[PDB]
Amino acid sequence: MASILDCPIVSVNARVWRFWSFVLKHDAMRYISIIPVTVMTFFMFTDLCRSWGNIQELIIKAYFAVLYFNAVLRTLILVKDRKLYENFMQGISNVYFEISHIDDHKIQSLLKSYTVRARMLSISNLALGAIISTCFVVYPIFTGERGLPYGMFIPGLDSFRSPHYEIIYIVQVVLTFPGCCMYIPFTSFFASTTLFGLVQIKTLQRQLQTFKDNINSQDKEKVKAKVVKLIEDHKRIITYVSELNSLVTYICFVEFLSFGMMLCALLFLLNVIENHAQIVIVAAYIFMIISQIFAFYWHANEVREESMNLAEAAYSGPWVELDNSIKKKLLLIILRAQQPLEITVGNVYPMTLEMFQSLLNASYSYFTLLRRVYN
Amino acid sequence: GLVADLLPNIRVMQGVGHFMFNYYSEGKKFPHRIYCIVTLLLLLLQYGMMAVNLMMESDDVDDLTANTITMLFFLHPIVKMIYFPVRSKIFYKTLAIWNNPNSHPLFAESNARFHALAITKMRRLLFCVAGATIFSVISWTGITFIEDSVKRITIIPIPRLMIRTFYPFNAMSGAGHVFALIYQFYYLVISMAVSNSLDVLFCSWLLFACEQLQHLKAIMKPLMELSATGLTKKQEMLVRSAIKYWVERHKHVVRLVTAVGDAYGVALLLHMLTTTITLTLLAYQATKVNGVNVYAATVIGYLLYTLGQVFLFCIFGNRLIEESSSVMEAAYSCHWYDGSEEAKTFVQIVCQQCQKAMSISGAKFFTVSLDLFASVLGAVVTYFMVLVQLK
């Protein structure tokens, strides 16, 4: 029986989520990771509200607060809908085994190429998260003042006086370890999932162009069975894309809003600071943010384009010599395939690179607004 | 037919301020006619008093903008109420469209189930919008009572009235003050009732269309299963009748959609124009906001009401669009390969037809959809950006 942890594509994210007991096991680690970070984000937002005085602290806080709120939101959706994610990953494992069992050189090569691509993306995302978390912790050192890794205020509690400060710092550091985790794998997971989508899509394309190979032409029963199988695989791909679409759709509506605000925040911050090396840290923040955004939008766009290329590959087949009925079936396949298998943002807008450019433009506009007001 | 399903909404329109002299006994035709005339006269009277009040308050820009926003918001119901009577025939044609629908001895159960679901959702929407309007009026009255009626020019005591208005009466002592209070409460109730009632009628039409599309898909699946085996002549006639039923019902839904677009196609245009103006003025007012208890509350309430109307229209337009697209999807995702030749050609033609989603347009200038709401939100936020930057 194929298992979630057996499939290379989803193995890394499954392991990371099972370590915190989000999607595979239930234990105290889930709550130990959720509740402290939720409280941290809440007090971060309170400090943000209370820090209307000076703009620099306001902006850095706001950035960290939005980042951690988005992480917590993603985690809450993941834990709330654990069963659907588990079922999706189990289906991914089953389809991965089925595809791997195929005996086509190009299909296998495509499988391995995309599997290694997904795994490298996941590990690179984890490494980038680790480094950027380290930069998070070391950020308040270069300034010199008694700063904190992330702003936080407790009602009527002094944070810059007495040894209490230190304790906060220390606990904050450990609070970073879950936080980054809770954010990164889902992104990777999306990518990974989308990549498998492409794999599946591309597989059908090959099976669409070679379905008549080794099949007797005289008898129409076997050709009919083969085209029926092709239709069934197309429907399976549609269902996969629809499920991933719903999940990542709500998540990506919230993600679009939060990413717009975060990119605005980082761009404004980079243009105000005057410290020695903190600008490099802000630049690393921007690199992380745009890397996640690009992963999301690029993979969704590829899903769409590969569905349309599925239509094209349906056209480029051995359909000239087939009987009339099989030609009608392939015409219906071309008809359906020309509609992109969109992964929508909040179910309102398909996720493409056009929305990526729009997000960048909106972030830059917000940055210009902040420049004008601050001046 | 469709009148029976929508009777609660039709009565809410009828008995409050909204003409519709079509669905009761001849006895109520004349008294109701006079009542409608009186309602229109009262609304227009208060509208004119508001306008004349705006006339003297044109010296400054803040008061002028607030008055203009109020004038446009109360323009909405006046336009709606003088728009329905002129287009009464098309509205009555939109209704009575489903008086003689198709029928098959096999797809009757799904038809009944989805008809019941449509009626339930219609009632749900009607009650939700009614609650929203009641919340709006009570919130208005509360904010007026807690607000301080002081004008800064020197400080002068403005009458503690719910809507700024120039009244020949004293409007300060008990008599005039209470008369104006009840009159303005009645104005608010009737205006919101008329506007939101016609809007909810439009949305109920859209809900009926969407539920009929869902029925069409849910029977598309067993329809193809029926076609699939090699069929005896009787089965050929049965599948022919099933194809006929599906096509006729889809054409009926298309007729309903076109009728709904015709009846309510230019009310959307006027609504969006008045909105655009109100949103511009409200963006300026928000640029004036500095976190005050009442000013910010009033601006946020105006924005919420406007965006809620636009959002309702866009929600149901998007529902219809996605329902047509899903019709295509559910036509594909079935066992159409084992179906007879006629059923396969029927699926081909249905898929070709469903390439484009049904939509409602503001007189062909735009389409009501969540894309339109997103564009409106983007435009308002961009104009607010420009206003704050240009300070």
Added chain:
Amino acid sequence: GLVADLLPNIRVMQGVGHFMFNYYSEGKKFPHRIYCIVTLLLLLLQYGMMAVNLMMESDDVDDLTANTITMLFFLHPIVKMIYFPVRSKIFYKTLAIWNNPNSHPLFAESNARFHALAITKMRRLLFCVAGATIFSVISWTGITFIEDSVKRITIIPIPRLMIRTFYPFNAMSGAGHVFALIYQFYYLVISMAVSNSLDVLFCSWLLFACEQLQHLKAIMKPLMELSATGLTKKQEMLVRSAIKYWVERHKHVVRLVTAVGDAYGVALLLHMLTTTITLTLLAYQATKVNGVNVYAATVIGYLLYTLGQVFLFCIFGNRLIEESSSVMEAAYSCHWYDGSEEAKTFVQIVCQQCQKAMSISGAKFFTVSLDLFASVLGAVVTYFMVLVQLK
């Protein structure tokens, strides 16, 4: 053929000096040439005098903007009347497109009915546009006469003329003033006549296309009824002939649309560039408007005329687009299920072709449609808003 149907438009544009020495006896060919050359020379002379005036009034920005708006307004017909002669070959090819039409005995009555309907609609459009132009000229003259011709620098009397212009004469006393008034009336009349006559010719082409499409749908229904039963060979050839008629007539309509599209697509590219510049200048002018004085009337008239030309083009393009989409809809909306496999295949291919709606493009840089009118209007209003905010 189509030359007979559009004969009134051809003759009216010939009479104003719009070239087209093609549709009368050779005898009138000679004098018409001299007439057209004289009209060209007079229009160009008046335009050059206006340009001299603009050069004299370059010391300020308000007069410069007003002059530039007038010059773009009066550049439109110069460009149109120089554009038609060079492209006369395409125009004559288009006008002779429908000399030899399709014909089937069964579908003759509908063909005649919709041909007559198209002729009536073309006449109605011609008369309406002629009335609009006459009203524009009369309003221009009236505004000229009520307005107090004077310049503020001190106050200096200015000659009272409909178009500001530099004249070697006094242009303020009896003889010079009378000659200038008559010449400028003639100018205005001829310029509006040429521009709006070519525009109306384009719109009449589109109207004929739309009515032919409507005929195609109206016979689409009885054609499919014809194919229904199975069929003997004779009925089979009857269906073949009906399908042949339908397809050939649809291809004829497509040919007409393509010719019109190319010719007036170049035309509209130029037209909309000029309109964009004029509307930018008019937004700036409207930023200066205060009160209900004559200045406001002139600005509103300029905006109305520009947006009216744009709206005419857009509305008829939208008519064509919606007619093609409705051809798809009416292809679906018949009783194909009762038909035969040949008729069903014909329906599927017609739906495939009608997936994309016919449209007219301005040299492929856009499509004329109410969406284009909405975009230009939105741009104008947004630019005006930012202009007022900046001021």
Added chain:
Amino acid sequence: GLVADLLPNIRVMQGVGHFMFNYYSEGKKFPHRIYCIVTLLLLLLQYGMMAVNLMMESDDVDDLTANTITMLFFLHPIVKMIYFPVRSKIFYKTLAIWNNPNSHPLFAESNARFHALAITKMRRLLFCVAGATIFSVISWTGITFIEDSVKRITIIPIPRLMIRTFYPFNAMSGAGHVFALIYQFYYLVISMAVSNSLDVLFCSWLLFACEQLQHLKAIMKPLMELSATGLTKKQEMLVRSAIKYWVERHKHVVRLVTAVGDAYGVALLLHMLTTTITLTLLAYQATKVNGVNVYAATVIGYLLYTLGQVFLFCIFGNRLIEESSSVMEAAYSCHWYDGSEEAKTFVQIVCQQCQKAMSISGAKFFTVSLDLFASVLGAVVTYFMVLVQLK
């Protein structure tokens, strides 16, 4: 194959400094490579000077933005000349795609005719772009020589050179002046030549694809006529072979389009990024224009060259798109009603496939078409208007 047709473009690229070490005898493979290296060096070497100039011109935004515009324009060719060697494999794959075309006895004459037409159009485009490049170079020389070399800080003379660069020499007296002029002329010629030659290769690929599509339609007509003349075994086999030829040739065209899309889509992504930045800077510069002085000529030349490159690309992308759509239309316009089930199914599948139009994308970030050029032009115009009004 397609390398014989594209031979002059390949030779221009090879001789002008591109790393096209594929299409000649192995002998001059050695010196050519060395030659190529030198060109690179020289280009970059001059770039060095230009770069350092920008460093000391970073005192006022005027000369800074002028230097930035020059730097971006001259970055274009370096990016293209470094892009081709990296992606040489895909370029050679595309150039060798058409080495084994299909063949049918009946459609050979049309194939030859349209191949000749494609070759003629490729040569025409190559000559036109070469003429434009030479015109630009000579215009730069003339503008440099007529204009007066002086810098205002006080007036200080500066070397009379095509572009402001730092030279360790005097660069003002005779010897340095002549050396700098010769080097700058060589730089200009080589940069424009390499960039425009790569662009012309892309556009020639697009032209060949479009002409093959035209051939496909021109034979689609007689293909259906062949099917119509129900059919004996020999006729059925002949129709089968004709359909095979048509479908295989269409798939070959799609393959060519996909390869071109990959390679020059990455290229176009980089190109449009650079041109967008350049156009923003050029709009800022244009807001500074006054009079009809030489400065206006330089700004207009920069804008014209940038928009000309963007245009060329959009022209040919839109040609490909419209050619695919016209393939659909011409698939409709045959006598399929009189054909056979096989031919009618072939027409149906061809139309359904053509429902999507071939296009080239800039690495999926956009699609190159006249809409893209219109968007770029509108963006730059609106930015210029905003900047000039805000000033």
